[model samples]
Target chain A: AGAAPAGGEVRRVTLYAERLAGGQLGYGLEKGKASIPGPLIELNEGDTLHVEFENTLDVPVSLHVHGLDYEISSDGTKQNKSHVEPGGTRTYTWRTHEPGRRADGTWRAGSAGYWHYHDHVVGTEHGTGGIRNGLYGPVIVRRKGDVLPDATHTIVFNDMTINNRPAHTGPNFEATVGDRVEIVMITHGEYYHTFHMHGHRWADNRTGMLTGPDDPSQVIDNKICGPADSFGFQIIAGEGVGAGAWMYHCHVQSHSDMGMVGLFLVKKPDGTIPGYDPQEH
Target chain B: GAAPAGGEVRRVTLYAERLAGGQLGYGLEKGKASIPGPLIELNEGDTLHVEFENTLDVPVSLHVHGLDYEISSDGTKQNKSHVEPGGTRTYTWRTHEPGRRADGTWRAGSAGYWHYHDHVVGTEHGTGGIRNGLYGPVIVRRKGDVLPDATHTIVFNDMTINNRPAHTGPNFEATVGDRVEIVMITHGEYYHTFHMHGHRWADNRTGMLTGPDDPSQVIDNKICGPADSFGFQIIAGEGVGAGAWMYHCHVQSHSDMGMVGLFLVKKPDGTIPGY
Candidate 1:
């Protein structure tokens, strides 16, 4: 069967909240054993996407697909009257009718970068803890048959405060002295966190909030993201550095001093260090 | 009492308080006190002796201005071996160089505004020192001189409002055409830039560092002062010289929030009565 012609097929995906072995994640306070499958659906230019929300949690829940160009009713804006109560489901259908070409004529279907989905209900306990605990994950929409780089690292920046005190004393990231590494970060927090990378500045995508009534074909330029929300970045390693630790944290002086921070280490390149196997560790 | 010289004879005293409180209240319990006394009158060769007693639960030290003394009694960092609680220490010194008087005597001393306070580690940090209230001024008078009729003692302090430092307070005021001198003190962890609105002052003395055994040997002789305690003399400058002028900790954030005060310099005539 011909891979459904551009703008010809409609794909459907469902989002659910479940309690897993690790910490709870999502925008709803619901607890369950299974969560909605993620990386939901691979999208293509001119294709139609249908997202369905299945609220299996005990309380009301909704989904906000950040950075996607859709309609008012389909885009999950606050006054759009789109919600799914417990044991209920709601479906949103929109067309991915955008131009599919890079300046060099390369196919650009799956090039969509870091994206996330979470609940946006205001004044609800589910809205507060759901997204924070772990109800959301990355959404990478790609073009046809596009292969990714050899190794990819996913880093998540969190505003982790426990018992009303900043949790500064936590596990930091470690690295070997001279390994060329690329770090991809997804930020999620309540306050404006200035992410500082010790060695370099990373590249950023310029697409503003996408879920609006604007034409999907035209990319919106010169827009900024909302406060205390998600964004992505990448960094590479340098040379002759002895294996040690590094720190990544918010730059607000008081906030950093108060604990909103973490650490990472650069290990020796040789896999001889104890528990040195990259795969196992 | 021969001829009872009519020159400026200034009397100054030290008051101890918690820096957190703007007003000078009761000193810390059993705290050492530097009493208000007649100003020290000195000639070029006069030797001075200062007796200091520490009455609190902590040890204390005092440093004298414009006088050269031994390092062990210098009241500096390395020489801070203090007078133990309830004990006493005496600093004796002689002025080799004469000072410039408001009139015309070889007043071998620092004739401008000067101050002395507790520099013990625990008391000098943050609200810990001033909160206990340990501070005072030192006025160096001329020998057998007669000119300026009266001397007024004014003290400069910093405080926080509603538990918030420098967040809310009234502006400091100073009048026009008056000779103003300030003895600024600091007992906190932050640095401040003290700025006077109507005049520029010479930050003539400093004791910010350690290791000086002689107070006069530690004279910074610089043009400006930093955060901790220091002395400055200024004749009010132009622009509305008859009204009130403000003096405040010039660290903009601190001043905006209220680490400020005022001084009023009145005309020589009786129209402006002293407050």
Candidate 2:
């Protein structure tokens, strides 16, 4: 694994909010390419991003982000008057900072965490309809010297579905043994869920990895999350536990029985999942 | 304040009684049990032998989390640890200090925010027992851990806080500058985000930063589920001055329907501003 370089970069990009088929909404980096979980937005500490957002939806929408340094101008809320009307264009600037000592000699926290963005103006002030319709995405900010993953996957428990997909249909992720896989988990909707993975665990902390031997973070295979909650972690695919169709689902008995489940399809180096029958799905 | 060193053996009697409202509870004395039970504290390397008496009409057991207990004290019907009606049992819980194993892996200590509940009441998993309230907080402190002046327990059992009615509060009072500790636990079939207004704690083992170099995130809101527990200590009105600070479940509906409380921090003159 390679370590992230020191931050302090300024970047710019364009984002589009468009309505998809079946009356769903999405965000995309390119026009007409909007997907359920929009796009993966990454940044390093001390970095800044200027997002030129264009709303293509028929109704009003906005990009409300969490865990970053954004002023009221970029609050992405209607009360703040930062939301975009249909067909309107706006530039939302988000900033990040590194951890350091302040002038008062107090330790200041860095702007690095597994965060998310969503629509905040649709349906109601809380964006209830917008999020339910799938206007959301993931944002991750990393500190300097953070370990980079070989692959990063996003899992959004939006309502009863994962990433606004139909029930029981995994937006299944694939990885080979020993691959460093990162999971950016975000939750939205009215209910709370306990996410559980069959055969993998990670430290419950900022990075989901233990700082060192002295670090006292608990290692857990399950975690509880609620509306607008976001956290991420990295695990070696099939590490110790070998390659297979590892199941990941909400630990809530009713939710899992209702088909809120997915698979981490870890394949062997030779390209096969042991004892997994594709016909089962 | 500092915690004294551990490694002591303690014993106490706990009674499981049926309340007037068809609810159940555990208490240190007979006929005086309350919902959510009583606070039990221990230090790392200490041991507790609980002489559990089930005075209820049905069977009950004492099970715990984040501690070391043998199968004899497993507290399940399958293990025959559950006591019959009017029967008694001695459940022994052991704690250990964090150290290195001979195989060179670090073993975490038993110091944490934990809880105990009935494992055999109503159902095999004690669903009815927990729903009716047979649980309590357990705190295991490490040596040199900061000791709080007062401690309070808040259990988000199902949609209720400590089995209390909605919109009502078992509010806690504290004077500014006092070190207040909170042991937050969750039970039943729901998950909740515990949120506090105008206060925050580190998302680590001790819930406080070890130093500036520690990367633990400072969080005011945390999500927890059944059988999960964590604790933290806060200086009452430390940065934000005295007032009635609200603490509640961040689940919008959960708070809307109660599951809220007040942390009444008082000024030095022993008065709270704005009531």
Candidate 3:
């Protein structure tokens, strides 16, 4: 038995679509606020997931986990089951266990990575209007002691709007110098984006599209995150330097000019934030 | 005035020096010796006129890889046999394969990105020379093609852009909707991947890989090795529309050390500002 108990865990999640500023926001609260990115679904390895979905929006929509361990059948509107009509409901079940080599050299265990679930149904209609409005959220899988970074920020893009706010004026997520900062980056809509940090770099990945311990590291400051692609990176808010507001933005010129940029404020040890005015962002 | 076409000839002058900006480096014509030499791009089937003068105490010959030339004009052999002390020599490269078409025109259109280097005759590919900024980019294009908004010949050496990190004279500037052609000329000894933010090549609109030899799939980034150059066409602010876009080597240390720049796409109403 690994760190996970033999019985593991289980839960039920529900989502209903409703119109909002950008589009339809998915809400788990059958009678509450409307939000894009539905609700955050966090789970540990070897856990069991049970999701109950409802459709109240006019058109058809579906829930899809881009890169997680899931069998067929439960993949709603993605293939088998037709679009659940307004007031119709669908239930989905999944086991989070995946086959991989454990640190102890065991042949089988659990695999973990950064993944997201979104509306795969809308891309085939009206230029991904579902994402433009908001029909997505994060689906994180971690093992014991592999807790998702608490010192992190999540950014989901809708064309040029970052979380519904255009580039330069979005909220400045705060932190202090020497703090470990992680950014969970996800791209949606019909365009691609490259997340670039003004004064930071991380060990991106190995060569040829896969990661391994023996592979040489690609320490990069900028990465092109395409549509429907999500990834994460961690860095020291103050690498060899001090407190100041730094710019983290899309490297795509047009997107940034259209407001796809923001700031990362690293405060002093005493908690005083340094102001940053990124040029032409 | 519109220039005449077909088998055109162009002349360029190069001087090899020992220092630039108070450091050991190479340079272009004169008074501007940087890490990477200078950029030279041409059209296929064109004849290149080059005048090479070595100002360094030692002798040097320019050797080019990936050109359509005969054995005598072969860079490696010529540099070794024709090394002169602080002497000047001229080299002519016929990048086009000579063929007479039915209409009496030249039949040659093999376009790709190439590179040139300073060679010292049998010295480990002139390792120390390239280490001292003895490399440059060479882009050959198809005939009758119009030039894009700008031709940025990026030499990825020393993990820096033109020997310095971006925002310190290595930054590329542009406006929204500008048709740009970026030429990535790689040097040094590491593998580098060139990635453009927000955009990608649909097919091979880039001179990176020509027809009959596609990388099979078009992508937003390209991987390059030493002496390899990739040229691609990009439209700034095509869809998502304007701000400061960045372009750089995906290799982290390379970019951190300064192989990066921003492509500034101003507002359509003309509100772009700053370098």
Candidate 4:
């Protein structure tokens, strides 16, 4: 007999509005703090998710679980049809009915690949600040029997001013020459983002507006990805043979220069990363 | 009996050389012509005369900047005017006002800076007119204006650097405490945002753009400068005369790479401070 169904547990996540500086990132909202906590549950292919969000900031907040193929009722597109007003709380309950696929044809749970959640109410200051001010995180749905990697890393690409100064500086990214990695990119601001991965191309599984969930064909354009969504890519280590420190960021020249950038490293044959050395060039 | 204190009539001759390949010095395309000066100095109410000679096989005409004299002499599109090859045309005008000034000696409308160029068809596009080398500057000065003690003629022209188009390079220099005057000239088809790092200069003239005679004719035929040449003035700000400041076309992508040049303002003590 199959193992008994695992009992569900109650989880809590709080997102506070706050100010962050001293780094190459800036938020549209005035300098303040916000917090988002989670029991970020692990679900199988056929599991049900019961998630709750509490908005503690002065503005209304909503959640857009990007890449989740579900009915309009469950998709956070329009009004905070799935929103939590200031000092209020909201809950989202949905069933994972599909098995997500990898580029190599392997099957996994609905959240196996890259995904993100953010506010989407248009014209409202809440949605604007919520998304642009780093109020989002990843959703990693694992398969029934797959083992977790020894290390899990989270990298957030941001558009900020140069020299980490607020207001005037443009965008920038940082990365060393060699290291095996996976990237999850999410855009929450009010602009289109065409993320390009230098030195390597990514496999895109159409799941957004460009390609609805029911569409039978899978189209992938390696050159660019979304405006307010997420994308995933896996890279191996090493240089010369595809090994070196490279950049992966938004292709929109203005936005890229404004801060939407991140770094990647392809380890050398000797197992050393390029930018890790302290010697002057 | 001040029997007509003899007024001196000054005459200057300019030449136009057509580069066989259309690429002149600074990577400017050939088959075009321009004058070396964009600004000139003259007293207010003085009689000014200019002679333009066309050396190329194609016909050409010179349009004076900001002077309202006669339509036939305006060198405009509807005119289809021309100075036959190896021929020259003389234009004369009286300065109604002391044009515009850059050094505050006179108000903007009192004294001015001006530019002149060819406006003939088939040779009036993309550096074809001025790029071919047929343009110069003219400045109207006040009777006793004691400014611009040391003058420098800097030509602000557009050119590409390293295969990229629309880039500009460095063009002027002067010593501290030395009053300087600048004359800018444009002959190409594109518009450039000429920027000086530490000063604000005014545009004294803008050549007119008119259409051909036929209603359906797609070519432009008429061109004239601002009704008056001295339309604007610019002042060099503090810290500007200390070191090497920059003045170039500010189209960003155009100037960042090459359409840029250093304006070395030497210290009064003769020390060339670094920028």
Tell me the tens digit of each residue's lDDT in model 2 across B1-275: 78777899999999999887878999999988988899999998889999999998999999776566654565766446689999998999887776654433344566778788886777655778888899998888988899999999999999999998888887999999998999998887887899999899998777888888777789999988876688899989988999999999999999999999999999999999998
Badly placed stretches (over 4 Å) of model 4 are: A1-281, B1-10, B19-39, B76-80, B98-110, B121-127, B144-146, B152-168, B199-241
Compute the lDDT of residue B12 as modeled in candidate 3: 80
Off by over 4 Å in 1: A1-14, A20-49, A93-113, A122-126, A140-189, A204-228, A238-243, A257-259, A272-281, B1-275
Docking class of 3: incorrect
Which candidate number has the best DockQ?
2
* lDDT, residue A115, model 3: 70
The best-first sequence of candidates by lDDT reads 2, 3, 4, 1
Please, what are the lDDT tens digits per residue for candidate 1 over residues A152-218?
Answer: 3434445543112235653455555443343434555564344433222222232221122211111
Error of 4 at A90 (Å): 46
The RMSD of every model to the true structure, in order and in angstroms, is 21.4, 8.9, 21.2, 26.9
- What TM-score, over all chains together, does every model reach? 0.38, 0.60, 0.50, 0.37
* TM match of model 4 to true structure: 0.37
DockQ of each: 0.01, 0.09, 0.02, 0.01
TM-score of 2: 0.60
Predictions in order: lDDT: 0.41, 0.85, 0.60, 0.42
The number of the candidate with the highest lDDT is: 2
For candidate 3, give the lDDT of residue A150: 36
Name the candidate that leads on TM-score: 2
lDDT of 2 at B227: 63
| TM-score-better candidate, 2 vs 4 | 2
